[PDB]
Amino acid sequence: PLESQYQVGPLLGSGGFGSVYSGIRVSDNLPVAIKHVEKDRISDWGELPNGTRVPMEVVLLKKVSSGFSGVIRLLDWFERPDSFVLILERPEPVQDLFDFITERGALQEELARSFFWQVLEAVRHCHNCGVLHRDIKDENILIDLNRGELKLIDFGSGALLKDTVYTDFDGTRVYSPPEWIRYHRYHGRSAAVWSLGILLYDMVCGDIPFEHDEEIIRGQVFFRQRVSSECQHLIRWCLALRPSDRPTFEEIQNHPWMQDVLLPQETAEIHLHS
Numbered sequence: 001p002l003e004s005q006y007q008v009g010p011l012l013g014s015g016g017f018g019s020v021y022s023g024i025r026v027s028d029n030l031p032v033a034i035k036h037v038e039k040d041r042i043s044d045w046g047e048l049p050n051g052t053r054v055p056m057e058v059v060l061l062k063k064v065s066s067g068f069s070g071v072i073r074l075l076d077w078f079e080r081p082d083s084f085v086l087i088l089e090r091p092e093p094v095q096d097l098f099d100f101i102t103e104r105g106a107l108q109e110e111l112a113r114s115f116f117w118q119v120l121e122a123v124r125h126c127h128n129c130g131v132l133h134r135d136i137k138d139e140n141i142l143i144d145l146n147r148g149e150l151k152l153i154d155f156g157s158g159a160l161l162k163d164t165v166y167t168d169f170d171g172t173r174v175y176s177p178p179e180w181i182r183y184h185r186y187h188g189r190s191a192a193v194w195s196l197g198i199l200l201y202d203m204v205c206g207d208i209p210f211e212h213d214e215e216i217i218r219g220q221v222f223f224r225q226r227v228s229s230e231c232q233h234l235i236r237w238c239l240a241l242r243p244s245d246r247p248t249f250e251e252i253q254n255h256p257w258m259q260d261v262l263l264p265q266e267t268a269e270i271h272l273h274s
């Protein structure tokens with residue numbers, strides 16, 4: 001057990017998710033992130049194929065763990081008297097998509113296309129593993145800059161995927177759908193698709209489309225940057241007011257705007273300077 005295994009570096013960030021530090025696994029010098037979550041702030045608990053009582057976040061991370069690099073991997077976890085500590089993979093060099101978009105502004109469509117396509121593969125992976133993320137947004141996406149690979153992180157608001165209605169939510173309100181805002185009800189997939197329309201708008205315009213409940217519920221989309229008609233059509237489709245008018249992941253990926261994606265490595269070479 002215990003913390004002779006890791007060397008702790010700088011605080012990377014803190015918020016509604018807790019406090020995350022940069023670290024290094026002593027035994028092999030592997031870069032990691034060490035995330036601390038307070039017990040008092042965990043409202044959702046689960047249990048392991050084992051039967052230990054742990055944060056749902058740990059259950060969800062283990063369900064999605066794999067060599068598939070589009071979703072962050074949980075390497076280990078520790079319990080403390082008042083907290084859990086999660087050891088997560090850390091790409092180096094790395095930048096979150098929110099910071100990238102702060103620096104670069106609106107992304108060229110070729111680049112948004114490659115990023116959005118990888119996010120779609122990542123989210124399909126979560127859903128295949130029985131996990132609904134419920135907080136897809138640029139702050140929860142890391143870019144592995146040498147490889148041009150995106151990783152979904154932060155499963156602290158997520159849930160087991162089910163086919164019936166959700167009536168709780170604690171992810172990001174500006175990425176939440178109209179049906180959550182009006183009725184406090186949503187189904188997991190069509191709510192995920194709505195957050196993906198907000199994300200894709202964020203990438204191609206450089207900020208999210210809606211800031212207020214009234215705008216979310218109206219669902220009228222205004223493009224403040226020049227954006228191709230095929231891209232605008234995909235976005236307006238993801239942002240359909242009625243959940244069942246939203247595309248499936250397969251319909252998103254077969255959309256004409258999604259064709260001819262760059263490989264991740266080509267993406268880093270052309271856009272991230274490799």
Ligand SMILES: O=C(O)c1cc2cc(Br)ccc2o1
Nearest residue numbers: 020033088089090153154155
């Ligand atoms: O909340 C998380 O899952 C999280 C934050 C984070 C930051 C880095 Br860097 C790497 C992995 C990470 O995972």
